Design a protein around this ligand. Structure first.
Ligand SMILES: Cc1cc(C)cc(-c2cc(NC(=O)[C@H]3COCCO3)[nH]n2)c1
Length: 192
């Protein structure tokens, strides 16, 4: 198993997300959402909020355990390793984004790391604030690289359908979509 940098993804994006059109663009969304969904499947967090931001970026927030806030080797944050080392999901999105921010909440603290220009870290994982001890979760916001995708316009209906389906499969978890470009909004939740 050979590890690679994010440059490898950028030179061969089709190999990881299939294409660089609308389908490939939305694959980025699926990757980030599936992480939140996987966490909820394990029973952590009961709502997953997706927001299409006005600047074109997209936000996914869950209330699971939060990504690891600890250190890897050489003082490098565990989360930075996940977002910058290709084990060939998260790193792929980061590599194909002009910028990405990840915010982690756990143990009364709120941490944040920011990446730019294809996943280059411009900060470390720094504590930016505090929260209630019970509050946990992960928030990821990314701006897809316009120099890679033929379209960077997220389609509300496409994402809405995918979240609806994810909600039906999860059960007892609320999935929401909010379009800040049009003020459109919707929520999905299926009981059992
Ligand atoms: C939106 C999004 C994006 C990413 C990369 C991870 C996650 C995420 C990851 C997790 N859970 C974890 O990372 C687990 C990993 O095992 C220790 C406890 O935390 N919940 N949510 C959510």
């Amino acid at each position: 198993q050979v590890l690679e940098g994010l440059d490898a993804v950028r030179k061969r994006p089709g190999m990881y997300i299939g294409s660089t059109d609308g389908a490939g663009l939305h694959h980025l969304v699926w990757e980030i959402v599936d992480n939140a969904v996987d966490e909820a499947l394990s029973g952590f967090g009961d709502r997953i909020d997706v927001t299409i931001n006005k600047d074109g970026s997209l936000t996914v927030q869950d209330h699971g355990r939060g990504m690891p806030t600890g250190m890897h080797a050489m003082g490098i944050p565990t989360v930075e390793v996940i977002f910058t080392i290709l084990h060939a999901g998260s790193s792929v999105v980061n590599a194909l984004s002009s910028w990405l921010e990840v915010e982690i909440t756990r143990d009364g603290a709120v941490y944040k790391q920011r990446f730019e220009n294809g996943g280059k870290p411009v900060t470390t994982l720094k504590k930016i604030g505090t929260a209630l001890k019970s509050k946990t979760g992960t928030k990821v916001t990314f701006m897809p690289d316009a120099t890679i995708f033929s379209t960077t316009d997220f389609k509300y209906n496409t994402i809405s359908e995918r979240l609806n389906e994810s909600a039906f499969l999860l059960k007892n978890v609320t999935l929401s979509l909010t379009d800040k470009r049009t003020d459109e909004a919707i929520e999905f939740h299926y009981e059992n």
